[PDB]
Symmetry: C3
Subunit: 114 residues, 3 copies
């Protein structure tokens, strides 16, 4: 699984622990060992949500499986919770795009998972 | 709808008002209310297009529906026009990837759009 | 084809000529003309892979066709090799997501392909 957050919250407002917390929580949510999980956080972005520049986040979660209607509803609660608590972003100013990746379309360690 | 522009044009060259203009133009183009439109502009990127470091942009437009052959031609005219007029990027140095998202795969405010 | 690499390696560690090299190698690998290849490299990122902040990369390759089981293995070998030799990123700390784009969903030059 990989989770990317792009946000207009400044770099100094991202707690130093936030990548590790996301890693641990996403491992639990996806059922994957934390060694597999990648996280990327991009602050200081030039962005608007509904025409406003108040704090907001555009995110993505890619996984080989563990994506679907019910699972995605659950992830959105988990991840809105974390962005609200740690980055002080209103949950109605967060979008998360979910991608169920085919193992043939994910490269790692000189080869793909297929 | 979500529109993201990555570009090597410098930050100082992005006009004040660009994100609002994109929000308004996309609301008209997609027919979706401006309150739900997200826009993200990332300048100063290390990029090459055709091996050249002249101004270029790599973009994406995600929407739940309103994506298709004829509609994407129209969006590309619109958005290339804006990037040429506002950021001085030649239309032939712009790619825009279009993504028709399943509502179950777009998280927002503790749930999905499904 | 468009290749994007996000990495926590610092900008000073990206060697001169890296974007040219990627352009040239991806043209060979995909069979597309270099004039149409786009490359984007984003260093200094806040990232973790397996909970470690050691050098790592998250990448994507988008192409209209030329994406599939064998081809993607070949790209991963090529690209992980280049990230290891050029940026000193271990291959087991790289993910590359592959996207086979429909031509109707790629805009360019005031239209689509």
């Amino acid at each position: 699984p990989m989770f990317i957050v792009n946000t207009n919250v400044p770099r100094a407002s991202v707690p130093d622990g936030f990548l590790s917390e996301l890693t641990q929580q996403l491992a639990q949510a996806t059922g994957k060992p934390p060694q597999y999980i990648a996280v990327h956080v991009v602050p200081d972005q030039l962005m608007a949500f509904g025409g406003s520049s108040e704090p907001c986040a555009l995110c993505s979660l890619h996984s080989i499986g563990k994506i679907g209607g019910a699972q995605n509803r659950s992830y959105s609660k988990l991840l809105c919770g974390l962005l609200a608590e740690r980055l002080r972003i209103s949950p109605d100013r967060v979008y998360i795009n979910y991608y169920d990746m085919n193992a043939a379309n994910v490269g790692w360690n000189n080869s793909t998972f297929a």
